[PDB]
Design a protein around this motif. Structure first.
Motif, PDB file in Angstrom:
ATOM      1  N   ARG A   1       0.879  -1.211   0.000  1.00  0.00           N
ATOM      2  CA  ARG A   1       0.000   0.000   0.000  1.00  0.00           C
ATOM      3  C   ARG A   1       0.901   1.242   0.000  1.00  0.00           C
ATOM      4  O   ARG A   1       1.448   1.566   1.054  1.00  0.00           O
ATOM      5  N   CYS A   2       1.038   1.913  -1.148  1.00  0.00           N
ATOM      6  CA  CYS A   2       2.079   2.946  -1.395  1.00  0.00           C
ATOM      7  C   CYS A   2       1.957   3.567  -2.780  1.00  0.00           C
ATOM      8  O   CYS A   2       1.086   3.129  -3.564  1.00  0.00           O
ATOM      9  N   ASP A   3       2.862   4.512  -3.080  1.00  0.00           N
ATOM     10  CA  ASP A   3       3.081   5.047  -4.447  1.00  0.00           C
ATOM     11  C   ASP A   3       4.566   4.967  -4.833  1.00  0.00           C
ATOM     12  O   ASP A   3       4.969   5.800  -5.671  1.00  0.00           O
ATOM     13  N   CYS A   4       5.313   3.980  -4.314  1.00  0.00           N
ATOM     14  CA  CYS A   4       6.603   3.514  -4.903  1.00  0.00           C
ATOM     15  C   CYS A   4       6.553   3.605  -6.428  1.00  0.00           C
ATOM     16  O   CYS A   4       5.509   3.318  -7.021  1.00  0.00           O
ATOM     17  N   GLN A   5       7.659   4.008  -7.039  1.00  0.00           N
ATOM     18  CA  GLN A   5       7.793   4.000  -8.505  1.00  0.00           C
ATOM     19  C   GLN A   5       9.057   3.214  -8.849  1.00  0.00           C
ATOM     20  O   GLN A   5       9.528   3.368  -9.954  1.00  0.00           O
TER      21      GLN A   5
ATOM     22  N   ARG B   1       7.101  -6.244  -7.485  1.00  0.00           N
ATOM     23  CA  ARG B   1       7.104  -5.996  -6.016  1.00  0.00           C
ATOM     24  C   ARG B   1       8.123  -4.918  -5.660  1.00  0.00           C
ATOM     25  O   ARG B   1       9.116  -4.770  -6.382  1.00  0.00           O
ATOM     26  N   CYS B   2       7.763  -4.140  -4.636  1.00  0.00           N
ATOM     27  CA  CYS B   2       8.597  -3.122  -3.945  1.00  0.00           C
ATOM     28  C   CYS B   2       8.848  -3.629  -2.514  1.00  0.00           C
ATOM     29  O   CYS B   2       8.549  -4.812  -2.270  1.00  0.00           O
ATOM     30  N   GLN B   3       9.391  -2.785  -1.612  1.00  0.00           N
ATOM     31  CA  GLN B   3       9.550  -3.102  -0.153  1.00  0.00           C
ATOM     32  C   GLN B   3       8.196  -3.352   0.530  1.00  0.00           C
ATOM     33  O   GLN B   3       8.154  -4.154   1.494  1.00  0.00           O
ATOM     34  N   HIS B   4       7.133  -2.674   0.103  1.00  0.00           N
ATOM     35  CA  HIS B   4       5.806  -2.747   0.775  1.00  0.00           C
ATOM     36  C   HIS B   4       5.035  -4.010   0.315  1.00  0.00           C
ATOM     37  O   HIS B   4       3.957  -4.310   0.907  1.00  0.00           O
ATOM     38  N   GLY B   5       5.549  -4.734  -0.698  1.00  0.00           N
ATOM     39  CA  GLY B   5       5.042  -6.052  -1.152  1.00  0.00           C
ATOM     40  C   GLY B   5       4.638  -6.039  -2.622  1.00  0.00           C
ATOM     41  O   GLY B   5       5.224  -5.257  -3.404  1.00  0.00           O
TER      42      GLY B   5
HETATM   43 ZN   LIG Z   1       6.004   0.462  -2.285  1.00  0.00          ZN
END
Ligand SMILES: [Zn+2]
Ligand SMILES: CS(=O)(=O)NCCc1ccccc1
Length: 140
Positions: A49-53, A109-113
């Motif tokens: 749950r994020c806005d990672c790019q 996937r990012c750090q948040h999943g």
């Molecule tokens: Zn993220």
């Protein structure tokens, strides 16, 4: 091919959804190329749950994970290849990378999943269907 397994949910590319997926249909959106089905087993994936790019995606047609920068979810033109009305898909994130039709379902996937699954390819771009705005995958 490929799916996300969180709780009693299976997330797949709508265009790769099976008879069993449709029989056990929970939610689908033709614009987003997503279908969610119900499962008997409990799934162990976590939905970012994020806005990672930034993140890593699995590319089956290279048997390789690639780190990528990707755009925010938006409505985009998808060029003809073999599938869909060679048209406009929503909630799509693009990155520079390799994608063939058989790569659909590869997880980003990012750090948040789990961010999303591979949904489109062509012209040196990979498109991912974001699942991050589907907060309901998280409970019941
Ligand atoms: Zn993220
Ligand atoms: C474009 S689509 O994916 O909605 N078409 C349906 C495919 C399908 C065929 C038989 C049973 C269940 C699904």
């Amino acid at each position: 091919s490929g799916a996300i397994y969180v709780g009693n949910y299976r997330v797949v590319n709508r265009h790769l959804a099976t008879h069993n997926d449709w029989a056990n249909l929970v939610w689908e959106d033709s614009s987003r190329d997503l279908l969610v089905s119900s499962t008997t087993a409990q799934g162990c994936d976590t939905i970012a749950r994020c806005d990672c790019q930034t993140g890593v995606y699995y590319c089956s047609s290279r048997r390789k994970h690639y780190p990528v920068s990707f755009s925010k979810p938006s409505l985009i033109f998808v060029e003809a290849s073999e599938y869909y009305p060679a048209r406009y898909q929503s909630h799509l994130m693009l990155a520079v990378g390799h994608s063939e039709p058989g790569d659909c379902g590869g997880i980003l996937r990012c750090q948040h999943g789990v961010v999303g699954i591979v949904s489109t390819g062509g012209n040196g771009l990979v498109g991912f269907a974001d699942v991050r705005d589907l907060l309901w995958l998280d409970e019941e």
